[PDB]
Symmetry: C4
Amino acid sequence: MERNKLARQIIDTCLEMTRLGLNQGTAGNVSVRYQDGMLITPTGIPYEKLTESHIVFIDGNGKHEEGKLPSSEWRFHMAAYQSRPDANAVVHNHAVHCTAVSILNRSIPAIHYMIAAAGGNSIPCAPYATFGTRELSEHVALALKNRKATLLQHHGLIACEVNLEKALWLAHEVEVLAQLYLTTLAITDPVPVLSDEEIAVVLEKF
Amino acid sequence: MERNKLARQIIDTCLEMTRLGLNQGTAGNVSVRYQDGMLITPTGIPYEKLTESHIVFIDGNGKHEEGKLPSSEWRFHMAAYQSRPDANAVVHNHAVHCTAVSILNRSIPAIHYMIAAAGGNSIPCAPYATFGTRELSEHVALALKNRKATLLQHHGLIACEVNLEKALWLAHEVEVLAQLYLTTLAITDPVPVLSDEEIAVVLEKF
Amino acid sequence: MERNKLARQIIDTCLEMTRLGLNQGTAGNVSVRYQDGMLITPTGIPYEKLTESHIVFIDGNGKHEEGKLPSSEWRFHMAAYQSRPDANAVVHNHAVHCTAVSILNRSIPAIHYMIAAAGGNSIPCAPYATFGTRELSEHVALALKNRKATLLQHHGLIACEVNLEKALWLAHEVEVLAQLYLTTLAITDPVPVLSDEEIAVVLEKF
Amino acid sequence: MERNKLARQIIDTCLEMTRLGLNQGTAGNVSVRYQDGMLITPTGIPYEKLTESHIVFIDGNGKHEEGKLPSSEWRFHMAAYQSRPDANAVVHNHAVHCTAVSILNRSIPAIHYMIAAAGGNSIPCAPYATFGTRELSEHVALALKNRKATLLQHHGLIACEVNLEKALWLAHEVEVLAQLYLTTLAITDPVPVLSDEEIAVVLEKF
Ligand SMILES: [Zn+2]
Ligand SMILES: [Zn+2]
Ligand SMILES: [Zn+2]
Ligand SMILES: [Zn+2]
């Protein structure tokens, strides 16, 4: 639980995220809770040139280390740490099926029982607001109140969890749910869903 | 035919299954017939951390080794060993095209002559029932009576065979059949199919 | 131009074909012209266990080496060598977009100027006939008369060329044309095409 | 900034472009500004056999080095260097989602805020004209006047930038935008877009 073990996993998550096809168009941002703020990936540097010493600490006041530019999307990683106190790692990306679904501006309903992993009977879509703005943050903060993952209209996904390992696993899971919904949406609308009861038992079980 | 040669192939099948894009969202479960029960992958451990000594033996009575948690989906691997006496390895996964087809709750008809590999003129979809429950098992058991692979509504696929090598090969084959049906379903419905006669000769031939 | 240089490239083509996503569900068959017959991949053996000494010579009379089983699909590799005298290597596969298009039983029209690589303004679909039968051969033989690649109804693709390098390149090219046609077919039908004149100049040019 | 550092990156871009799934059917062409002309990939040679000494210098007069054939598509890399004076590297490819969109002959509108990377509220499609012709060049030259990437009807994509690193990054970005538009187009038409105002702020911001 040293700074650099934390900055290495963040890097490992980038590379691994890219491995899975989650980060295409080198746009993801990864962060973890630390001290009174967080560590996040820097802006600019492509993921393959990232060393532990690129990772930027941002304190709880919004000030970032000297001579380092945090991701341009950092403000909403801060929103999720204050909206979800149990959240300890945060993953963001423009994964394609997620984003297609966010362009349609729809929530993904309970088409498959793994929707439960994000906490309920859906994956919501928060409305559009320019990137890096405080209003973008307000949407995300209210979206993540009862869910661990959220789509972002005309933009992409955010997934939060107790460590990067599970944060990643959820992000990825939601990408699969996303693809499944688009692929069936092209055949029939609406798509058959599982009742709220049924999701209730899966959540009890989970 | 030692315990560990069996637990290694199970692992090799996981990794290889993941290689092909069959296991996405680390959800597959693999098992083989053994003694009076089976060996299966454990629950929790991601596939890349699996050693031979993680694999859990479950006896024919339903009791699993001490201090090891079998997959949460083990009950229906047991159903397939008792429904199909010739089945010696079992593969399960939430492969995406299979699952999309299982969300539509349709059977995949004879759109291509390789449907014969699973034993007949289709790949059925058994109805939904909560995971890990005995009622889930009853559906799978009656589904696999005349077929070696079956979809599972709002859930995924199960494929059984004489060893893991062919169990895997079928699983994979069905994923391709799945994709083919969705891709053509988006253009025209119904999708052109091959007569029952025609499937009869392919089965004779096969 | 020894037997084994020829059997190695056949293997290299299998592995490479699998690399590109052309051979999924280990179904492709590869062959090259040799002496008075050809060399072809054997039936059964998965591609990763193939050594040069697995490759089976089939003479012009239809008799195959002693103690070796040629692909089950060999008869139509022989049809293409007698239908196209300039053909020296032959590639076959159940590539998914090609096959989806062959399930719709449509020819792929001049949607993109690379259709010219196969010799004209389309990639035809020959009608269905059971695999391995002489009637399957008659369809393929008349299909390849004026084209170097052909789809096969409810089955897959065949592509022929002066060596394996170009045979492969065409096979692959046709897979891309296939995907392009399906992807646009789901939006609008018919798909915009390039006039016959226009294809004429591309062929002059090519 | 030697000739060979420039010819190596061109090669690295080919291989890397192929890595991402941008160059399928070995059709891409890459070039960089040099002296009074450019360096470009040669025609024929597959990308895996390219050494630095294959790369052909073409002067500003249209004459190419002795005993070397430039890409057949070189004329329009020259058009982009004279249409966009700030352009220093050029990437071209028949990437599949881009091309499907170019077969529909539509421009990709502001479905996602990254459309701004190419300079405005869209990615245009220039009309069809035979490859390698001066009229093909006139279309591309007027297309790239206010945009850094353009689709080409029934053909593919062109993306230009200050070096190969960003030229590639844009090409790739546009492929993702392309896929997103097709995937949502199959569900609903028109696809929801972001106002011109909204794109204006993203461009200010960017
Ligand atoms: Zn973003
Ligand atoms: Zn399952
Ligand atoms: Zn075949
Ligand atoms: Zn081109």
